[PDB]
Amino acid sequence: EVETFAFQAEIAQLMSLIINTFYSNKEIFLRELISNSSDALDKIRYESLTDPSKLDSGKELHINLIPNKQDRTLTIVDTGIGMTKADLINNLGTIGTKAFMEALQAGADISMIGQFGVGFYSAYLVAEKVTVITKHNDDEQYAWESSAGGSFTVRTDTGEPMGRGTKVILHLKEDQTEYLEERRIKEIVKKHSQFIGYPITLFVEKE
Numbered sequence: 085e086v087e088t089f090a091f092q093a094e095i096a097q098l099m100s101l102i103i104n105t106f107y108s109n110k111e112i113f114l115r116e117l118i119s120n121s122s123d124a125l126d127k128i129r130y131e132s133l134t135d136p137s138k139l140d141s142g143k144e145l146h147i148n149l150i151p152n153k154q155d156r157t158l159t160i161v162d163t164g165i166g167m168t169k170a171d172l173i174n175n176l177g178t179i180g181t182k183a184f185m186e187a188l189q190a191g192a193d194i195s196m197i198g199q200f201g202v203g204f205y206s207a208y209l210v211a212e213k214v215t216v217i218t219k220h221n222d223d224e225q226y227a228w229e230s231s232a233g234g235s236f237t238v239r240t241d242t243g244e245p246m247g248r249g250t251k252v253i254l255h256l257k258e259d260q261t262e263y264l265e266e267r268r269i270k271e272i273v274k275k276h277s278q279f280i281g282y283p284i285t286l287f288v289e290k291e
């Protein structure tokens with residue numbers, strides 16, 4: 085009930101570079117993922133203009149951020165358009181990077197991943213493992229997942245349903261746990277993402 089796929093070569097290269105780099109400016113991953121969530125929300129919102137049954141799976145258009153120190157995960161949840169099994173494998177599996185890859189001339193990364201369509205992968209600046217959970221109106225709920233190393237998996241999600249949208253779960257590296265800190269997140273969002281056109285809500289952890 086689980087399929088394994090290979091990353092297109094250019095993507096695996098890019099990932100290996102990100103995973104390893106000592107790049108300082110790691111917080112930019114948060115801007116890339118919020119930026120992707122914002123695009124997905126634009127998509128569903130604009131589709132709903134001509135066909136409001138679109139929103140039947142959820143009217144709220146927002147972005148949630150969820151630190152979990154017991155699990156050492158940070159989750160970004162949106163209720164944008166979401167991805168069918170096929171968008172999921174295309175979008176996360178293939179490329180584009182060449183641009184970027186050849187962009188860091190003879191060097192190691194830059195805050196320009198975003199302007200290059202591959203900003204998602206910057207998640208690997210801070211995470212040893214990413215899981216992507218996604219619900220498009222047309223399809224079932226799927227879980228994508230990869231610890232890098234050239235392959236990802238795709239299966240049908242068994243967990244709580246989402247109605248619609250995308251959920252990006254980062255399993256944080258041992259020494260990047262500052263992004264589970266309420267203070268650091270607020271600061272990061274304010275710096276890189278406050279002019280995003282949807283509510284971004286930080287969930288504070290309970291005692």
Ligand SMILES: COc1ccc(-c2snnc2-c2cc(Cl)c(O)cc2O)cc1OC
Pocket residue numbers: 117118119120121122123124125162164165166167175204249250252
């Ligand atoms: C163009 O840029 C794109 C941006 C978003 C997506 C998609 S569609 N459904 N979800 C997202 C999305 C994807 C990711 Cl990775 C994420 O972190 C959050 C999400 O809501 C597709 C894009 O390209 C088809």
